[PDB]
């Protein structure tokens, strides 16, 4: 172990940085909106069949069988969204505001 | 069957519709979206499965 430390021997500002060059974009400027059922997995509708029908018509699946990963996702929060099989466009990002 | 035409309606139960009816109610830019479910039904422009 080598314990070093810095002391600013200049007043005001003596060192600058400059964003200068783009290599490329990590994301895709994708439009896949944020899946709020992954963001809030706990919440359901009060009536049962309206919850089932909204999840069916929106295409979002429910957890089928209960496991320690299901309760760990519901309690702690984890990687609920699974990695896509093919990604030519890279990372994706979009979120919504009224 | 011309006489027993209410005997089908004598039982009171919802009947599921076909996947053809599940297909025809889709607009042309939602037919290709992943939320559409009848994509495994269409395999050929001449035949429906």
């Amino acid at each position: 172990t080598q314990n070093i430390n810095t002391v600013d021997m200049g007043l005001g500002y003596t060192s600058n940085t400059c964003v200068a060059y783009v290599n490329r974009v990590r994301t895709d400027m994708g439009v896949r909106v944020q899946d709020l059922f992954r963001v809030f997995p706990m919440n359901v509708y009060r009536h049962d069949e309206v919850d089932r029908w909204i999840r069916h018509a929106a295409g979002v699946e429910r957890p089928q069988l209960l496991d320690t990963e299901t309760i760990s996702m519901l309690t702690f929060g984890s990687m609920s969204e699974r990695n896509a099989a093919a990604t030519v466009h890279g990372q994706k990002a979009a979120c919504e505001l009224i | 069957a011309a006489r027993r035409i209410p005997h089908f309606y004598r039982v009171r139960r919802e009947v599921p519709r076909t996947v053809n009816e599940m297909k025809q109610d889709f607009v042309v830019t939602d037919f290709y979206k992943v939320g559409n479910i009848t994509l495994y039904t269409e395999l050929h422009p001449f035949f429906d499965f």
Partner: protein
């Protein structure tokens, strides 16, 4: 096997003086690095409003604990304990110790107390240390907070309020505490909620599955024990269904995907309780200092 833990923040020499009084005590660290930032030291990274106590116990169960050894001008010399070797641990726990006690480590209950850890804190960081409690007090206080969690739903009546008022007050040799209620703002914390609901549903699936499974094994060779098991469940049925409507019609035929889901659900809901079922011992004491300020304890684990 020593760890260095530095602080990025400015510390005074008076901060060292109020730090060096915690000279040989346990800290948790999440994993063993040779050099670690102080933001991972202590339970401050985990404690917040909406997690609760049982999260702290569960993440303390696998958090590696480390005795403190020395304080330097900027860094802290930590010493990881080893199995079977004696060490010196100071009793920062709220309960006095005696010779021959078995010690476990549980998260503290006086979060943000009047002491405020004797005012050892930082900018958006208060150093929080886990309690080292004797094993029987640890297990009974776990049971006490769990049955506090059961009555937290039905807080309408007043005799349950007197019962939980008994539940807050604990008794021990020159020790009395007011245990904080896990229900706050008329709602339970989520960890106590899932722990108690899983425990109750394990009891439910047991009470409705044990008959068919003792029959399924009792078609084999029989003993007196399964006979008295069936008789005990008959006692439960004859004291249970005295007001329920007759002919409930439980069938001997049931599709397999039901009962395999029932068994796996029962097993996972009991499986998520063993952080609070088993009390993994971590220390026993071979000699207690006078005024119980410290103790030469032997490490277990």
């Amino acid at each position: 096997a020593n760890i260095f833990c530095t602080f990025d923040h400015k510390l005074s020499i008076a901060d060292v003086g109020k730090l060096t009084k915690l000279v040989a005590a346990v800290v948790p660290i999440p994993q063993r690095l040779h050099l670690i930032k102080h933001y991972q030291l202590g339970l401050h990274q985990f404690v917040d409003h909406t997690r609760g106590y049982v999260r702290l116990r569960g993440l303390l169960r696998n958090m590696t604990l480390t005795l403190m050894r020395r304080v330097e001008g900027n860094q802290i010399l930590l010493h990881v304990p080893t199995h079977g070797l004696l060490y010196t641990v100071l009793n920062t726990g709220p309960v006095t110790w005696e010779k021959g006690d078995a010690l476990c480590v549980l998260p503290p209950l006086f979060h943000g107390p009047l002491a405020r850890e004797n005012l050892l804190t930082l900018g958006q960081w208060e150093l929080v240390l886990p309690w080292i409690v004797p094993m029987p007090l640890a297990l009974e206080i776990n049971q006490r907070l769990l049955i506090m969690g059961l009555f937290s739903l039905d807080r309408s009546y007043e005799e349950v309020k007197a019962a939980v008022q008994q539940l807050q007050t604990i008794t021990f040799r020159d020790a009395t505490f007011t245990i904080p209620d896990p229900v706050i703002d008329q709602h339970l914390l989520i960890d106590m909620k899932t722990a108690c609901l899983s425990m109750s549903m394990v009891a439910n699936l047991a009470s409705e599955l044990t008959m068919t499974y003792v029959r399924k094994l009792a078609l084999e060779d029989s003993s007196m024990l399964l006979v008295k098991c069936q008789e005990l469940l008959m006692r439960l049925d004859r004291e249970r269904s005295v007001g329920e409507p007759r002919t409930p019609a439980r069938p001997q035929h049931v599709s397999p995907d039901d009962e395999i889901a029932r068994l796996s659900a029962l097993f996972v809901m009991l499986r998520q309780l063993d952080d609070l079922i088993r009390e993994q011992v971590v220390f026993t004491v071979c000699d207690v200092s006078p005024d119980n300020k410290s103790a030469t304890c032997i490490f277990k684990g």
